[PDB]
């Protein structure tokens, strides 16, 4: 009988209980005991769910109040001193590191540690931060979270497998603090290993027989000298006095690093065969006698019902290489990255809901697959699964002939402007006559809003009253900008709740959930859109508010759009067609929008792709350069239908060559000399500080726009700043 395994379970709660209790604790409404009681109730509920589903290997220490990497930093005393001088008990040191700390000496405003994207998932972890003076050690009176949680589950009669981030990944994903700029985190390895060993011994003494030790940096391009550290670390940790170690990898391909793990004393490995099924043969063939192979075949980052027949076949290949006794059916990664429970959806059509599985359902999928490859009769589940998979692949939701046919029209001309920039600029100058050092802003501006969204969705106020409120907000914002004297304006987007869902709602091919929440960072969660089929845009999405904003001023009003790659990356994508295809479909839908904007007189249009870098494939090579090419192609498909006098803008927070590939008229960036398309380097503060910072960037005149850093912060600050920025632009004129 082949075992089933889950690498981690989302902890937010089916009703976002974790968010509610933590935010209550932070605002003084709940006590720390109330906090802890809710956490314990969440963990117990999630363990019992997993046991009842029949999962064999059930994780502990996957729970967190904020972030699991932060939890380890607190456990190992990677705590910078500044957080320690306020008499905070350890759980409050933890929160102080995660979210910062303010006290009424002058006031304290101690900033949080940095938030970092966890690989290419949509989760963010708190950066481990080390100094030359870091003394790594266990903190017994803080409680040892993985020991305590292991024991809690055991007392419920649930044997679990503690999960911790391994020492190489933990140090390598961390960074040197300000006061220790030359420190290489990985150099700290000999100092941290004794703390890992101690932790593992305490887990063993409590009854833990296996531990999942995550080494996800093995899917990254690692220097050779980092590669050798795996043999060192794991030779030091393995022994009679510790649990068996299952070295766990996800999100990518470990083959370039196989030599690093081919002679390890660990008890087994886990690999992600959803993202990289093709590494199976080579990773299997380095397993030593006795080592087990955990085959990650149930996607931990997407919401589609698994094809039981294909997932079992992947598992059956593993079984053929190393033996039925040495394979485990697993989720590809932690279920951290999926929503909690499909059964909470109250509005989804049953046809569509038949195609999905969220975390709770994925528990049943790993069990049924495990039974299937072990020889049990599960033909009824197999048949029902095959029926769902079949229905999806034949549905019209998925296949729209017009979109298919439109994809066949994509070619170079469709992704190229009618003329090159220099010629375009001469028509743009005749049209706008913008003065040199033109001034604009990047988008957002500074209460009552949701109040009016609300009575409108319940039909209490007409579309008529709703529109006048929107238009009054737009009005305020436009007049404010005019009185400051900005040259190119924005409307403020009071009509928009969310950069991606605002578009997804208005596009075919999308479905939406009531409860599909995923933790993004801390207590902040996202409810991503789902791409279910071929995307098209039946009609104008933004034209109305932009046309109204443009009508009350003789300054150029920017249209504002989100790009195709960002819409794709902050949605749950289809798993039946490539990312590329989904991006080009989005490019084409956005092209209709850009063209309608231009048609309605909105001939300055900003299109932002803030997710481009998060989507970078994890290793260098063909997949990465293909991604950068199609990403840019998709942007150009959206923006290349316009006349020469229409001005495409794009704004970047974050590689100059990719930016160049977009051929935008104006790029706002928050030493590429021979590049004609114009740039606004972000400046935001004195008029003279402005005067200084521009003067020094001087060291090209006709090419510089002036603008802030990213969206706007209180009215007096924005005003004073914006007004100072404009004054500075005028001197130079
Ligand atoms: C800009 N970001 C973003 C994204 N993904 C999506 N889909 N949308 C986004 O705006 N990924 C990267 C980053 C994530 N940052 C954030 C920041 C705040 C909240 C947030 O405030 N969430 C609210 C719920 C908002 C709502 O009502 O939907 C919360 O309090 O949990 C979420 C993600
Ligand atoms: Zn920005």
From Swiss-Prot:
L-homocysteine binds at residues 442-444, 493, 608. It comes from Candida albicans (strain SC5314 / ATCC MYA-2876) (Yeast). Belongs to the vitamin-B12 independent methionine synthase family. Changing residue 453 to A: Less than 5% of the catalytic activity of the wild-type. Changing residue 115 to A: 22% of the catalytic activity of the wild-type. L-methionine binds at residues 442-444, 493, 608. GO terms for biological process: 'de novo' L-methionine biosynthetic process; cellular response to heat; L-methionine biosynthetic process from L-homoserine via O-acetyl-L-homoserine; methionine biosynthetic process; methionine metabolic process; methylation; symbiont-mediated perturbation of host immune response. Its cofactor is Zn(2+). Changing residue 117 to A: Less than 5% of the catalytic activity of the wild-type. This is 5-methyltetrahydropteroyltriglutamate--homocysteine methyltransferase.
């Amino acid at each position: 009988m082949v075992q089933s395994s889950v690498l981690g379970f989302p902890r937010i709660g089916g009703q976002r209980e974790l968010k509610k209790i933590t935010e209550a604790y932070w605002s003084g409404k709940a006590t720390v005991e109330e906090l802890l009681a809710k956490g314990k109730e969440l963990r117990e509920h999630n363990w019992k769910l997993q046991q009842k589903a029949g999962v064999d290997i059930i994780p502990s220490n996957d729970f967190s109040y904020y972030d699991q990497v932060l939890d380890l930093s607190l456990l190992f005393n990677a705590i910078p001193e500044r957080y320690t001088k306020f008499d905070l008990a350890p759980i409050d040191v933890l929160f102080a590191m995660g979210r910062g700390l303010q006290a009424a000496q002058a006031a304290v405003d101690v900033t949080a540690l940095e938030m970092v994207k966890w690989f290419d998932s949509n989760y963010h972890y708190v950066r481990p931060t080390f100094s030359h003076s870091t003394e790594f050690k266990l903190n017994t009176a803080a409680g040892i979270k993985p020991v305590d949680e292991f024991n809690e589950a055991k007392a419920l009669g649930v044997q679990t497998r503690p999960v911790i981030l391994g020492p190489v990944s933990y140090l390598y994903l961390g960074k040197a603090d300000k006061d220790s700029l030359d420190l290489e985190p990985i150099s700290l390895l000999p100092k941290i290993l004794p703390v890992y060993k101690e932790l593992l011994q305490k887990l063993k003494e409590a009854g833990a027989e296996q531990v999942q030790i995550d080494e996800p940096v093995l899917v990254l391009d690692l220097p050779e000298a980092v590669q050798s550290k795996f043999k060192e670390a794991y030779d030091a940790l393995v022994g009679a006095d510790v649990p068996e170690l299952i070295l766990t990898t996800y999100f990518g391909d470990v083959r370039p690093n196989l030599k690093a793990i081919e002679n390890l004393p660990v008890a087994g490995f886990h690999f992600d065969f959803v993202r990289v099924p093709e590494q199976l043969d080579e990773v299997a063939s380095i397993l030593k006698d006795g080592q087990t192979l955990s085959a990650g075949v149930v996607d931990g980052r997407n919401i589609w019902k698994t094809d039981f027949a294909k997932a079992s076949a992947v598992v059956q290949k593993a079984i053929e290489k190393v033996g039925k006794d040495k394979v485990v059916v697993a989720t590809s990664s932690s279920l951290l990255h999926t929503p909690v429970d499909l059964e909470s959806e109250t509005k989804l059509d049953a046809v569509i809901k038949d195609w999905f599985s969220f975390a709770t359902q994925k528990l049943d999928e790993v069990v049924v697959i495990a039974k299937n490859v072990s020889g049990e009769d599960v033909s009824k589940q197999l048949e029902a699964n095959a029926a769902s998979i079949k229905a999806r692949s034949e549905s019209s939701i998925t296949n729209d002939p017009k979109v298919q046919e439109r994809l066949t029209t994509i070619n170079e001309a469709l992704a190229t402007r009618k003329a090159a920039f220099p010629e375009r600029l001469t028509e743009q100058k005749a049209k706008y006559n913008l003065p040199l050092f033109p001034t604009t802003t990047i988008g957002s501006f500074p209460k009552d809003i949701r109040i009016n969204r609300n009575k409108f969705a319940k039909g209490q106020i007409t579309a008529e009253e709703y529109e006048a409120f929107i238009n009054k907000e737009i009005e305020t914002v436009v007049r404010f900008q005019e009185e400051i004297g900005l040259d190119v304006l924005v409307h403020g987007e009071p009509e928009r709740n969310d950069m991606v869902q605002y578009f997804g709602e208005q596009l075919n091919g999308f479905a939406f959930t009531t409860n599909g929440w995923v933790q993004s960072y801390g207590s902040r969660y996202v409810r991503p859109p789902i791409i279910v089929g071929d995307v098209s845009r039946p009609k104008a999405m933004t034209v109305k508010e932009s046309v109204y904003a443009q009508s009350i001023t003789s300054k150029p009003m920017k249209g504002m759009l989100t790009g195709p790659v960002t819409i794709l990356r902050w949605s749950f994508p289809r798993d039946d067609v490539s990312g590329k295809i989904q991006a080009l479909q989005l490019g084409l839908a956005l092209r209709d929008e850009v063209n309608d904007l231009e048609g309605a007189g909105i001939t300055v249009i900003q299109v932002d792709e803030p997710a481009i870098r998060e989507g970078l494939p994890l290793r260098a090579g063909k997949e990465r350069s293909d991604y950068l090419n199609w990403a840019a192609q998709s942007f150009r498909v959206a923006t290349s239908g316009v006349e020469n006098s229409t001005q495409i803008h794009s704004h970047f927070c974050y590689d100059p060559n990719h930016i160049k590939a977009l051929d935008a008229d104006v790029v706002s960036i928050e030493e590429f000399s021979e590049y004609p398309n114009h740039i606004g380097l972000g400046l935001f503060p004195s008029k003279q500080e402005f005067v200084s910072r521009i003067e020094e960037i001087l060291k090209p005149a006709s090419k510089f726009w002036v603008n802030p850093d990213c969206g706007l912060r209180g009215w007096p600050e924005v005003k004073e700043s914006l007004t100072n920025m404009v004054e500075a632009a005028k001197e130079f004129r």
